[PDB]
Design a protein around this ligand. Sequence first.
Ligand SMILES: CCS(=O)(=O)[C@]1(C)CC[C@@](CF)(c2cc(NC(=O)c3cc4c(cn3)OC(F)(F)O4)ccc2F)N=C1N
Length: 381
Amino acid sequence: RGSFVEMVDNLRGKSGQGYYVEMTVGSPPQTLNILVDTGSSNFAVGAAPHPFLHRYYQRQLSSTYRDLRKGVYVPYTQGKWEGELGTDLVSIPHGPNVTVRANIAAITESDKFFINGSNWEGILGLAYAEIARPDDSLEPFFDSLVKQTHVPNLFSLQLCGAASVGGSMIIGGIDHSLYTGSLWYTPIRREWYYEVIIVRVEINGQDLKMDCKEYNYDKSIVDSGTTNLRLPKKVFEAAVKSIKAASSTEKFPDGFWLGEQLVCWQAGTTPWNIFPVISLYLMGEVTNQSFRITILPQQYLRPVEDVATSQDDCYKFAISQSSTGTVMGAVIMEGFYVVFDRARKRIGFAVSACHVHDEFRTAAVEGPFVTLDMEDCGYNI
Ligand SMILES: CCS(=O)(=O)[C@]1(C)CC[C@@](CF)(c2cc(NC(=O)c3cc4c(cn3)OC(F)(F)O4)ccc2F)N=C1N
């Protein structure tokens, strides 16, 4: 259709707390704010009165609730949640005009999961069944939505940064007002995470000249549920070394680059221009063809507004090292309109109409480029 006016601006959030959509669960409808997460595959909601929660799923109030009589325990690298599986009727007030019977994990115990001060009480896992918990028989929400309705097998995300954030989750299509120029598509390598292949990395146009397999060790994913651009250790080391050299006009402590401390400047006097652009070349749709996406310091140097001990403008270096491969989190996604074209196993990138930039530099999506041996960039076990 190309125009989904009802769904524009259906995302809200706060800096560092993520992007949530309004959803309803059960009959009569119970309203919940739900984190949009392309890096997981469970629809999981608070169902107990945790003190951090504004709202929670009260199963006893729902006539359409069905118990699946099975639990689920989900440990993460930091915290944890545990829940009871069921199904109920789910809709998205500012989404398609439909109602779906979806799997819902009713969260009954958690640790370091809900954020104190956040305005969301659940997670919408938008990735594929392969990574669903406890196993791939638990149908993810979007799979149910496509199966039960005529909603096309596609969604797109415009995450708008820079303190309230906003944006759009267009379910079933693309809204052309949300981007400028053309969309460029990269293949979904495998349907588990939204896995992609990075084929080349530039800092201010200067190639890292690394074995491209390192860029995707052990994978590269697109994840709206991650803040940072997360890079594998060796790639992070090379990237930081290059960013240091590009920004050597000013010197910063080692801890800043490791995200161990913040750096603060006098109000409205951030030297963005001293900081380099970051370009990721992604595998294209065609043999030997790639395209380039480019982000600015506006994306990777992120303001920290909850600093009581300082009066200045303080920033977090939001590129970090990873043991689980590249993660293209909000640092990447805030620059772009991202199309998760499930029907065609591809992810589209275009310059976001809402991305934060200055008058000298702009986030960019450019192609085509000639890149050989792009298949060798993918990692195999
Ligand atoms: C493999 C991906 S993962 O499964 O390990 C994981 C990174 C952690 C676990 C989970 C749920 F599965 C998860 C994510 C979050 N997000 C955020 O809080 C959050 C905060 C943000 C953001 C994006 N997001 O952009 C921002 F605006 F800058 O601020 C919170 C609790 C969770 F429990 N989702 C992922 N994508």
